[PDB]
Write a protein that binds this DNA or RNA. Structure first.
Ligand code: 1FZ
Ligand code: MN
Ligand code: MN
Ligand code: NA
Ligand code: NA
Length: 326
DNA sequence: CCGACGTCGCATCAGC
DNA sequence: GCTGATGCGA
DNA sequence: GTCGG
């Protein structure tokens, strides 16, 4: 948190450009700059010092100078004072509401938490649930609670079929003391890149987690990705745990390492690894790393037997999950 | 200067 | 119903 | 908004 003030300013500008301007690359430019400054091991003295960092250009250097001089930024100050920008920024915080829907709602005059609650009938299912647990989703999850959620999920998974392997990824696997949500990778020997010997492989796990009232809600559900809500069980007389977002991803068993690399993160790290992969002449997704031919079209999947193999291909020295927090 | 900016899953809509 | 685009999210 | 070429 050496440059907490700086990275906060940039993050707020990224949010503005994404939610209001709907300029996604501006959003990413700010997020990359915030990331590289976040891991800069010096307390930045000037915008020029920051300009040396990759991702920081002239315009951001000037804002860093203004911030360091006065303690704030006029551009952000004005944005904060604007009703439409402030209202749109807020509505996007509800899960399922993006830049488009937020702007749409404000146009109708729907622009407060209270405005939303009286207009429940104008939200889709995802947005409905996002509103429902708006407060709960603001809260972090302490690693202790994550550890409880881990054993529940992993044990419930064991009961449906002993051949299911469940791995908690995301920030948890990176050893975070607190997480925004729970991210779960799922593998079963009946599901490979070569066939699907069993239907409903993800459904049965969702079903089982619902039966024990762990999973409480569903945002979206397909044959490989579940997006929903879960809650820890509480003892007698004690207040309830907050409801928590949970993502579950069923990935073909033989493609585990690309999957576990993808879902481990971080978000920016994953974005950066694939960007670097392109520079090296590869393409990486959650399933495979494929080489790009002379024409630019991806070839056949390269063999992978570890997370490290993927690092080796794009000529990166390996980094532990706890060192991938960009 | 100026093109390019990771890659994919699910919900939902237009258009047929 | 399908396909392709768009919105939102991992 | 930034950058490689
Ligand atoms: C949001 C996001 C996630 N991911 C991958 C990397 C994340 O670690 C993984 C889980 O998504 P997440 O839970 O939204 N990110 P997290 O677990 O690292 O962070 P947190 O503790 O939930 O805030 O999915 C991307 O590859 N691109 C993205 O834009
Ligand atoms: Mn997470
Ligand atoms: Mn998640
Ligand atoms: Na730079
Ligand atoms: Na949202």
């Amino acid at each position: 948190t050496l440059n907490g003030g700086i990275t906060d300013m940039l993050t707020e500008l990224a949010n503005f450009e994404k939610n209001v301007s709907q300029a996604i690359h501006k959003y990413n430019a700010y997020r990359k700059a915030a990331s590289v400054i976040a891991k800069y091991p010096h307390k930045i003295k000037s915008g020029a010092e920051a300009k040396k960092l990759p991702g920081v250009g002239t315009k951001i250097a000037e804002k860093i100078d203004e911030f360091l001089a006065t303690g704030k930024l006029r551009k952000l100050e004005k944005i904060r004072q604007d009703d439409t920008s402030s209202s749109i920024n807020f509505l996007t915080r509800v899960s399922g509401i993006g830049p488009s829907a937020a702007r749409k709602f404000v146009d109708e005059g729907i622009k407060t938490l209270e405005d939303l609650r009286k207009n429940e009938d104008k939200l889709n299912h995802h947005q409905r649930i996002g509103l429902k647990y708006f407060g709960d989703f603001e809260k972090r999850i302490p690693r202790e609670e994550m550890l409880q959620m881990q054993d529940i999920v992993l044990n419930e998974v064991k009961k449906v079929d002993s051949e299911y392997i469940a791995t908690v990824c995301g920030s948890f696997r990176r050893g975070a003391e607190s997480s925004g949500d729970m991210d779960v990778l799922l593998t079963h020997p009946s599901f490979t890149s070569e066939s699907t010997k069993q239907p409903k492989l993800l459904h049965q796990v969702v079903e089982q987690l619902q039966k024990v009232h762990f999973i409480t809600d569903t945002l979206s559900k397909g044959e490989t990705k579940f997006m929903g809500v879960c809650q820890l069980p509480s003892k007698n007389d004690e207040k309830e745990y907050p409801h928590r977002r949970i993502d579950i991803r069923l990935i073909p068993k033989d493609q585990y390492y690309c999957g576990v690399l993808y879902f481990t993160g971080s978000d920016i790290f994953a974005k950066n690894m694939r960007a670097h992969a392109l520079e090296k002449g590869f393409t990486i997704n959650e399933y495979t790393i494929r080489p790009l031919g002379v024409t630019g079209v991806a070839g056949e999947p390269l063999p992978v037997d570890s997370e490290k193999d993927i690092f080796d291909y794009i000529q990166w020295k390996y980094r532990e999950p706890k060192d991938r927090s960009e």
